[PDB]
Subunit: 207 residues, 2 copies
């Protein structure tokens, strides 16, 4: 029969194949193989279903205490990074979740995950919010761009490297100097280096 | 029918009717010029969006004056605030930057931002092996915070109270900072996060 996981699982599958716009009453009802005149017992609105789908995917990626706070933050970030990689629509829903969904359940859970590590890192209470939000914003920006790219990467990077090597050496001394480095650039490694950079800044806040 | 004119027109349209509202007729009409001769100053929509994004970014980043005691860190902040304020004045900007860094290998905005950030990274004494890493991290951070800012005072209060409703035993951290959500200034958060990244970057220099 119709359960929670089922409803959500169905929307996720649809979001992965047909996207947001493809997530409709009929589509859901059909994939669920249940009567449309009795599905109101397990659903409410589309906005709420998108939230439940976003939440289910995030929770699963992040959760699926013996390591350092820094490693724990990395597991949280990779969970988000891999999830938005497996589900392209996820990145968009997270932005909407933090912009127009005050009662959203995903935000506070991510914030709890990151915050506990920030406190375990010895960060003064006056910076708990700041440090946690920075980690979050960093994650969304890198993972957001990664999702945009997952919407070939080695070919795109090779064309960028080429285009930059064609820039005037006197006008762009830095960009010309790094152009070569763009070629074999790995996004995942860059992501984790960025995380470490942020964590290093946070660790310096210690007392 | 100058360059600035064409671009200025698209920006005005992008600000009022958005991307979808940026059409041949709209541009031609606002330009008050014959549509049968505008091919001399335009190419495609993709290229026009890029020129519009570039014009706005260049103007914002080089806008304000430099400070009498500006260090590399301050300069990076000026670049970031220029981007933050620009995406705030032009909502469509955030989306164009993502597309610019995902499908526009020959784009001109990316290398210019990277040149701006890179020179400061070098001035900070960052080993050459990390020039791209450090620069990309700043960029990803900026896109993530500014991107979220583009998406979204009334919201913050709702979030603050909503979070204050979370179970205190399950969400010890979130509950501890809950109230800080209200009156939380996004702009200051933005600058604090960039400073956090810059602190991590400054630790890349070795005596």
């Amino acid at each position: 029969p119709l359960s929670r996981e089922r409803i959500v699982g169905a929307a996720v599958e649809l979001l992965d194949t047909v996207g947001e716009r493809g997530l409709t009453f009929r589509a859901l009802a059909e994939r669920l193989a249940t009567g449309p005149g009795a599905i109101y017992w397990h659903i409410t609105g589309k906005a709420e279903l998108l939230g439940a789908a976003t939440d289910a995917v995030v929770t699963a990626a992040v959760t699926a205490a013996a390591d350092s706070p820094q490693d724990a933050v990395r597991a949280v970030a990779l969970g988000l990074w891999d999830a938005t990689e497996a589900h392209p629509w996820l990145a968009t829903q997270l932005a909407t979740q933090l912009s127009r969904t005050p009662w959203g359940t995903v935000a506070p859970r991510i914030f709890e995950s990151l915050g506990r590590q920030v406190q375990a890192m010895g960060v003064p209470e006056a910076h708990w919010f700041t440090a946690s939000s920075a980690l979050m914003h960093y994650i969304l920006g890198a993972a957001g761009q990664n999702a945009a790219n997952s919407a070939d990467r080695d070919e795109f990077l090779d064309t960028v490297s080429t285009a930059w090597e064609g820039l005037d050496p006197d006008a762009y001394p830095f960009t010309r100097a790094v152009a070569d480095q763009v070629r074999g650039h790995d996004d995942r490694e860059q992501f984790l280096a960025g995380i470490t950079l942020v964590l290093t800044g946070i660790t310096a806040l210690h007392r």
